[PDB]
Amino acid sequence: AFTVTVPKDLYVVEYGSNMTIECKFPVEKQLDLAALIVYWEMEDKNIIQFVHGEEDLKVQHSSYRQRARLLKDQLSLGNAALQITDVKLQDAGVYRCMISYGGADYKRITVKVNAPYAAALEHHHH
Amino acid sequence: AFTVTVPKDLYVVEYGSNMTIECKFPVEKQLDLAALIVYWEMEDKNIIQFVHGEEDLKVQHSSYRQRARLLKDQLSLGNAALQITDVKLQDAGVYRCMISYGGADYKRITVKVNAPYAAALEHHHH
Numbered sequence A, B: 001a002f003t004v005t006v007p008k009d010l011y012v013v014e015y016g017s018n019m020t021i022e023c024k025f026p027v028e029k030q031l032d033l034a035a036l037i038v039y040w041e042m043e044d045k046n047i048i049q050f051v052h053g054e055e056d057l058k059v060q061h062s063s064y065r066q067r068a069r070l071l072k073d074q075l076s077l078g079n080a081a082l083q084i085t086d087v088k089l090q091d092a093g094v095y096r097c098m099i100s101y102g103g104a105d106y107k108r109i110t111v112k113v114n115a116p117y118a119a120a121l122e123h124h125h126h
């Protein structure tokens, strides 16, 4: 029974801080990047797609260019970690990590962003 | 290049009718049930999980208890079709057909429910 598990299903982050959200999956023996697909989406926006050993930038949403990365190194430990730098109020919401390695499964994580008045004000006047 | 395709991305169904929403994936030669995982979800509510050889109800959202089934027969033709019997207003929303058969992909399907006043009235209050 191939299962994806999330240590924390809810992260609370401060505006402008850095965030790492984890998804754990079981890895037997040595990791076979060829058979691994890691996909992170956030409310119908592709964040990262890791397939065939490499990330696909052709589909990455431009809002996450050069601020969202998968910690490729941690995949060998069965850890699919997404790191988003410079967290903004627009990053609050429901993330999904979908993994395909033998089986397939997925989990949802919720992110809340605390912000001072100033940052909230600019976000409000969109 | 593994693609899931949906003939219709929007279904309009009448309250109390039966609904089937189609989801296609490419299957060359013979289908390998061992490698197929089909997930149907509806706005972060799991409807069905088809893993290994048969669907798993272990996590089915109660709102779909005993009203949603996967048409196993058509999986061989690359058709992961979900059937909801006795469609209700709460079945309106965005469905997700997630499939892993070699590659992995998913498609969103939107469902609208037309209803007479009486059913709308009862749905509105409870």
Ligand SMILES: Cc1c(-c2ccccc2)cccc1-c1nnc(Nc2cccc(CNCCO)c2)o1
Binding pocket: A037, A038, A039, A046, A049, A059, A098, A099, A100, A104, A105, A106, B037, B038, B039, B098, B099, B100, B104, B105, B106, B107, B108
């Ligand atoms: C469904 C899935 C699973 C999965 C499959 C079956 C059950 C549970 C999970 C696992 C890993 C990756 C994916 C996957 N799903 N596909 C991608 N990446 C992607 C990149 C760009 C665009 C799109 C399509 N966006 C919706 C419109 O088609 C998807 O990850």
